[PDB]
């Protein structure tokens, strides 16, 4: 039996909006430490890793470890029926044939109970090592979303160059080319508003903008985004879900022979 009660239901909603368009089906690993999820997209070019720690929920209880196969479109449909101020409780039986979602509205006269059917999925999961990256950029998530969307007008691929003093984003297509240069913030007043770069060696990689525009759907989860780059290693785009966990998108680069 698994039961977790989360007062800020909006977080769950945003998570599902950050996943439903990239991957259709995913296995949720429930354990005493919390909720974990990992899935590549259908093309295997990108990967999503979600972690929601038990300490982040208002109440958490997991007796035996569970693996719930979920169609993410169905779960997002169910969660759109929740309000941003609802208290959301997830519950599953020991056999866990279905997953129950209880939404307690802020009107205090409305309680909703949804029962989502679960299925048995055989998902390909990868071993992601914990490593140190040659270049790390921390920037406002909205600025990053705007950059990816804007450069999608210019071309299909973006070249990210992380250097000591700043980071540059490059796109090229039939109509021409463009470069956006974000210098390291000189007057760091609000840490959420700043561009900071931690570098060991400068890094330069090429990525597909369609996947990045899928990634940026996590923007409502965090005011900042962190991009981690090493040479010929897939890039990591990290949104921290405050005081609970994170959502990480991994993107394989386009490499010249």
């Amino acid at each position: 039996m698994f039961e977790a009660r989360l007062v800020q239901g909006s977080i769950l909603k945003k998570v599902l909006e950050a996943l439903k368009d990239l991957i259709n089906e995913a296995c949720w690993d429930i354990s005493s430490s919390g909720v974990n999820l990992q899935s590549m997209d259908s093309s295997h070019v990108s990967l999503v890793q979600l972690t929601l720690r038990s300490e982040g929920f208002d109440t958490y209880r997991c007796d035996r470890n569970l693996a719930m196969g979920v169609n993410l479109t169905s779960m997002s449909k169910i969660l759109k029926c929740a309000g941003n101020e609802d208290i959301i409780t997830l519950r599953a039986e020991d056999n866990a044939d279905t997953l129950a979602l209880v939404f307690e509205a802020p009107n205090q006269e409305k309680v909703s109970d949804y029962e989502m059917k679960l299925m048995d999925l055989d998902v390909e999961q990868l071993g992601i090592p914990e490593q140190e990256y040659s270049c790390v950029v921390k920037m406002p998530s909205g600025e990053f979303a705007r950059i990816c969307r804007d450069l999608s007008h210019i071309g299909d691929a973006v070249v990210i160059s992380c250097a000591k003093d700043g980071v540059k984003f490059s796109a090229s297509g039939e109509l021409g080319n463009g470069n956006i240069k974000l210098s390291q913030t000189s007057n760091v007043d609000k840490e959420e508003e700043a561009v900071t770069i931690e570098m060991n060696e400068p890094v330069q990689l090429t990525f597909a903008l369609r996947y990045l525009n899928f990634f940026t759907k996590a923007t409502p989860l965090s005011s900042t985004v962190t991009l981690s780059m090493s040479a010929d290693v897939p890039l990591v785009v990290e949104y921290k879900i405050a005081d609970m966990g994170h959502l990480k998108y991994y993107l394989a680069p386009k490499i010249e022979d």
Binding site: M40, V45, L47, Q125, G127, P234, A252, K254, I255, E256
Partner: peptide
């Protein structure tokens, strides 16, 4: 000149 896959870097397991 080639889009790589996540499996080109990480093993499945």
């Amino acid at each position: 000149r080639r889009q790589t896959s996540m499996t080109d870097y990480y093993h499945s397991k």
